[PDB]
Amino acid sequence: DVPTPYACYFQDSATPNQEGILELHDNIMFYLLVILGLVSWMLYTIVMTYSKNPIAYKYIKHGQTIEVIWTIFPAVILLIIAFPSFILLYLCDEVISPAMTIKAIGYQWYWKYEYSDFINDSGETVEFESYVIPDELLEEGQLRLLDTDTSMVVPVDTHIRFVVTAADVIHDFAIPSLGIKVDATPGRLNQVSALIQREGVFYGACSELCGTGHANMPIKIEAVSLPKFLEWLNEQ
Amino acid sequence: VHFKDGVYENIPFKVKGRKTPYALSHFGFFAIGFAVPFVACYVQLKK
Amino acid sequence: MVQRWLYSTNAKDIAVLYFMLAIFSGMAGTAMSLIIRLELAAPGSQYLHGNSQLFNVLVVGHAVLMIFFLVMPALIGGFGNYLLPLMIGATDTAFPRINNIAFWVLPMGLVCLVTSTLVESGAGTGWTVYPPLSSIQAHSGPSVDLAIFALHLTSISSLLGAINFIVTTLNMRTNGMTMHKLPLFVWSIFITAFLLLLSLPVLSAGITMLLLDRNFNTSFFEVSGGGDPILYEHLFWFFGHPEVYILIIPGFGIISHVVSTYSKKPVFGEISMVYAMASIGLLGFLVWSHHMYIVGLDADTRAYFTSATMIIAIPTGIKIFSWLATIHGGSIRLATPMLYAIAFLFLFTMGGLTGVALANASLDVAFHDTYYVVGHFHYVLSMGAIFSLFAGYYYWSPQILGLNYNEKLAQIQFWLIFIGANVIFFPMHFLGINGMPRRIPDYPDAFAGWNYVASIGSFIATLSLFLFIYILYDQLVNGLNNKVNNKSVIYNKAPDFVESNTIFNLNTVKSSSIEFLLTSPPAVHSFNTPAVQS
Amino acid sequence: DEETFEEFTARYEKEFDEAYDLFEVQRVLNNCFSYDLVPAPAVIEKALRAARRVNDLPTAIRVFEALKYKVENEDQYKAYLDELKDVRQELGVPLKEELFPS
Amino acid sequence: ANKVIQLQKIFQSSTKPLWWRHPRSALYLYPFYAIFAVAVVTPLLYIPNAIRGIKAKKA
Amino acid sequence: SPLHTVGFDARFPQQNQTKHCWQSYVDYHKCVNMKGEDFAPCKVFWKTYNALCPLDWIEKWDDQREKGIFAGDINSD
Amino acid sequence: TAVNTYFVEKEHAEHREHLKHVPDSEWPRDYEFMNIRSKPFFWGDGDKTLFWNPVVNRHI
Ligand code: HEA
Ligand code: HEA
Ligand SMILES: [Cu+2]
């Protein structure tokens, strides 16, 4: 969604992959929190007891059976936490019935997005520009580092591929709500699979160094109704 | 080359000196602690 | 009189000189990082008139200075050349000329990097120098060449020091010492030196290739001309991750030595974890590529990389539990080394927890390059390096000087750095979950309060550094007073309820080496007789 | 590796045969109390006579208050009470009437 | 030879710094490596002396 | 595009698609510039180079062919 | 190996002597790889080039 001051929770999920990965990470961090509490209680009880320890033991070395017990415990624990991770990665890395494509090859210090999948009037591609709004241009109705010249429209309820590349320097297409982020090598070409489920406005930025104007390279996307989106791609 | 007991001479500085009783060299150390970032800012911008 | 401080054939002078250089670099880096955080204290231009070019110039200066001139030189050189050939019974270490050459090629690096940072163009690509991000078109001038030369000379110095340590271990071993039962510090330095010898040359070759690209204007890694910068990216990864091991493992050995010489009990599974550390050193060449999950590798390759990266993560927990057992069943004292080690281990457990959270590849898609990754490595590197160095200094200052250090000043120092680190690092969880966008001179003002508390913690750290230098002055001026009275700790370990006062007085330390009861560093001719052990 | 423990005991008595000062008594007491084994009254009396070979009543205080506070052992008291009572009545070392009322 | 023994005897009977080995080379190098070094180092950082005095003030 | 235009990915399921457009375009060019009458055999993978492949590279190749100078390492025949 | 390599070098590596003067009829099919802008060069006097090799570019 939109970053907020003093936030306490992750933004609303925009794609089913996002909700799935966040839930699986929530379970993983649940396990991580319980083991961290384990270690914390270890440290607390040990220091509290041994701040006045009468005798210092010296002749306990290996305990081979219980040693291999806590040696094989982490292996099975990580395998257990990796099986859902295994199935999640196996499902996410594949693309199942993609519908259309949107591409973003941004130049140096600013973003450029391509809508070649949709035809403006007849055959011709859809292409527009988007530049940052500085403090001088920051008038009544724009946001600093969050408002760009033109927003990026997304087809709601439609499987969408992100064929992303760059021209001069690697530019990071970042949309945290959609759970999408791929560094775009200028010479290479990368695509990922996603689909937006709800209607809303999301903001992004460039989480990869560009140059002098790396900072003022935001990403401003949005979602509208399907007739409105089709009409916008028709007029533009 | 083999006349160092190793009690106070291990430090690469001379403790003796009325002009610098570890007061002028260490004040220079104070100055150079923040000197490089200040001059780096001053070359292109203002502090 | 100047040959001692310019042509030091003895290792101790070089060790203390490396310590001075590293502490100078560290204080400069801390001050300029305070300046940077003040710039990032509030969005806008309050002290620096924007200048994102300058912003990234000081950002890369921050990173490069602390990585290459604070953590590396002293933390390995001093401990190595002061313990590794001394405890084994060798009379004097070999290759003084090599160490002097390394020292005297260092100022080339310092001056060249200062000039590179102090030019109008400058290099500001950060710790990552992958082209065309590091291209000469944006960062013109001589900055790239000077940085490359500094990289080359620092790599040469570290590689030669590692070679000297390795040959000393292999040849200068005393007759009465088995190889399987070497102390954890010796094996730690052994693994670190071999990993450095197998890692630095690759990065040096890559840096030389980039220098050739920048000078002769050829086409190897530029996007135009059919180049592949991902080769140098992989080279930098296979440097940094083994370099992370290089920075951390000697800290592990130092903590092991501290706990062994303090807790008065053996380390649980000492030989077993010596074998485990050997396995870590042998298998470190397989988990270097868990950061490139998004470059465009195959799914099977992702599976292999993630499998390796969480199958080599068990020994961290093994060491945690082994040191927990080492402090278990024994006597723990309210001394600064105990608390330093405890804080380091706890924050390292959280850092490893975050890393394990990062181990998954599916979550990386929405988690990579977010705030969580930078928070994670700031956690691990910061606590590891800084607390290991602090514990080493506060544990080794009476070993090399013999002049006692105040207990009260040390405790208040620990409390200051500890509270600063906690107040800085606790909100990073919320910062990561919201998605603070990294490396922005003018970030959105939503994170204003968190930036304020981070700036407060950074300023606490800077006043703590002022306390450090004032503590050094206090020691230099009142070591005699500290020896006279009880204002400073006199003995490392407290007696148990078994020992008489006279017996403990004549048995003050029962450790694994004579260094503790070795008199204040003697002349250049020490250990005139071989060490016998049974 | 659950090694033998009577070997270290026999080492204690053979060092008693070679005992030359209270230093050896301190060393053997520290080594014995360091182990997880609870000393039987026989070895306790051997340690007591080793400490008394120099006739040092403070060492008797040390060994008695160490027996009273050697190992928690799930908070064993009554056995400790009877053992201290008999190792006191054998010779007589009244000290608990002084430090306790403090 | 007929000069190595004499040189060794001279060194044994007179222990002095600088090895008493390259006097002409020392006179050709060290005073030159001082004066010419100053002459080649100082102008590089003395050219901006006229420009020196930047207060970062603009109108 | 109601969640289904080409079905499951078969041309190249992997995320990286660097050497993807050239193969999808060479066959189309060969089928087009050989008689100029029938394009039925090569009338099924339009979306391969229309949506899956960027159109910027396609239009760059078209302009290069029109101007008579090509940048790719291809063969005249 | 040395003598046969010398023979093949004398045979097949001597056709570039006349490359200086050649009609623009068999020129290779070039593209953006060549004839591109570079950093302006101010050092020197002769042709403003790093080395006096006026054979790298055949276009005036
Ligand atoms: C070596 C690891 C390391 C350490 C320890 C630190 C420490 C810190 N780092 Fe940094 N940091 C990096 C590695 C590290 N960092 C890297 C790789 C980057 C990314 C680089 C980039 O992309 O360019 C980065 C980037 C980075 C940024 C991003 C820059 C931006 O775009 O604005 C910021 C932001 O403020 C930051 C802050 C800090 C802070 C506040 C600390 C604090 O922990 C500082 C506290 C440290 C001290 C306590 C030092 C004490 C000094 C002494 C005198 C030592 C005394 C010891 C003895 C000799 C006895 N770091
Ligand atoms: C001190 C050094 C250090 C340590 C110890 C670790 C520990 C770990 N690190 Fe990290 N890491 C770095 C240094 C370190 N890291 C640096 C510098 C980077 C930045 C590089 C780059 O990406 O730019 C980085 C980044 C980084 C990434 C990059 C994320 C992305 O792709 O962008 C990943 C991803 O997998 C990762 C993983 C791990 C893992 C799995 C561990 C684990 O080994 C942690 C081990 C600890 C535990 C095991 C937890 C405690 C013990 C237990 C509770 C035992 C039981 C639990 C289990 C066995 C499951 N690290
Ligand atoms: Cu790794």
CATH number at residue C245: 1.20.210.10
The whole domain housing A131 covers 100-235
Residues lying with their CB under 5 A of ligand 3, a single-atom ion? C 241, 287, 290
A92 labelled binding-site residue: no
Nearest CA in chain F to G28: F69
Cross-strand pairs, A190: A164, F16
Torsion of CA C212, C218, C220, C222, to 10 degrees: 110
Nearest-Cα distance to chain F for G30, in Å, is 7
Q: Do F70 and G33 touch (CB under 8 A)?
A: no
Within a 10 A sphere around the Cβ of C190, how many other Cβ atoms?
A: 23
- Degrees (nearest 5) of the Cα angle C288, C292, C295? 150
- Which helix H or strand E contains C429, and what residues bound it? helix C428-434
Contact F75/G at CB under 8 A: no
CA A99 to chain centre: 21
Can you give the residue range of the structural domain that contains F20?
1-77
What is the three-class DSSP state of A101? strand
Q: What is the rounded CA–CA span in Å between residue C115 and residue A149?
A: 39
Range of the domain at D81: 1-102
Residue nearest to atom 58 of ligand 2 (CA): A74
The answer to whether A62 is a known ligand-binding residue is no
Cβ of C523 within 8 Å of Cβ of B45? The answer is no
For D13, how many CA atoms within 13 A lie in the half-sphere containing its CB? 9
Total domains in the fold of chain F: 1
Distance CA C204, CA A118 (A): 49
What is the C-alpha separation between A102 and A118, in angstroms, rounded?
9
Give the CA angle between residues C138, C435, A212 to the nearest 5°. 10
The range of the structural domain enclosing residue C79 comes to 3-506
Largest CA distance in chain F: 41
The vertex-A112 CA angle with F74 and C224, nearest 5°, equals 35
Distance CA F69, CA F64 (A): 5
Nearest ligand to the CA of C28 is 1
**H or E element, residue E11:** helix E4-13
Q: CB neighbours (10 Å) of residue C355?
A: 19
Residue to substitute from D4, D35, D65, interface A, most A β-carbons within 10 A: D35
Q: Spell out the SS3 assignment of chain D.
A: CCCCCHHHHHHHHHHHHCCCCHHHHHHHHHHHHHCCCCCCHHHHHHHHHHHHCCCCHHHHHHHHHHHHCCCCCCCCCHHHHHHHHHHHHCCCCCCHHHHCCC
Q: Name the residue at shortest CA distance from atom 15 of ligand 2.
A: C355
- Separation in Å, CA D15 to CA C261, C510, D23, D45: 26, 20, 11, 16
A181 - beta bridge partners?
Answer: A174
C-alpha distances in angstroms, C235 versus C135, C195, C198, C374? 18, 14, 12, 20
**Chain E touching partners, 3 or more CB pairs below 8 A:** B
CATH no. for residue A142?
Answer: 2.60.40.420
Cα-based torsion angle of the residue sequence D45, D51, D52, D55 in order, rounded to the nearest 10 degrees: -160
Contact assignment for C53 to A212 by CB distance below 8 Å: yes
Contact D76, D84 (CB under 8 A): no
Q: 3-state DSSP call for residue A202?
A: strand
Q: What is the resolution of this structure in A?
A: 3.3
Residue type, C425: F
The torsion angle over the Cα atoms of residues B19, B20, B21 and B24, rounded to 10 degrees, is 120
DSSP secondary structure letter of residue A193: E
Chains that touch D (3 or more CB pairs under 8 A): A, C
* Residue A218 token pair: 């935001």
According to DSSP, the residues that pair with A132 across neighbouring strands are A148
A122 alpha carbon – ligand 2 mean position (Å): 52
Q: Is residue C312 part of a domain?
A: yes
d(CA A113, CA A126): 9
In the 8-state DSSP scheme, what is residue C228? Answer: -
Beta strands A219-223; A152-154: pairing state: parallel
C509 Cα to the center of ligand 1, angstroms: 37
The domain tally of chain D equals 1
Residues making up the annotated binding site of C for Cu cation are 241, 290-291
Using omega within 30 degrees of 0 as the cis cutoff, is the peptide bond preceding C521 cis? Answer: no
Q: In chain C, how many domains are there? A: 1
CA angle A207, A210, A213 (to 5 degrees): 105
Q: Which H/E stretch holds residue A223?
A: strand A219-223
DSSP for C440-507, please give it.
Answer: -SS--GGGHHHHHHHHHHHHHHHHHHHHHHHHHHHHHHHHHHHHHSSSB---SSPPPTT--HHHHHTT
Spatial distance between the Cα atoms of C355 and C377, rounded to a whole number of angstroms: 8
Catalytic-residue membership of C502:
no
Length of chain C, please? Answer: 534
B1 touches chain E (CB under 8 A): no
Ligand nearest to the CA of C346: 2
Q: Say whether residue B45 is in contact with chain E using an 8 A CB cutoff.
A: yes
Look at residue C519 and tell me if it is in a domain.
no
Closest by alpha carbon to A171, among A220, A105, A127? A105
The tokens for A85 are 């991770």
Ligand 1 centre distance from Cα of residue C60 (Å): 11
Q: Which chain A residues are Cβ-neighbours of D4 within 8 angstroms?
A: none
Atom 13 of ligand 2 has which residue's CA nearest to it?
C377
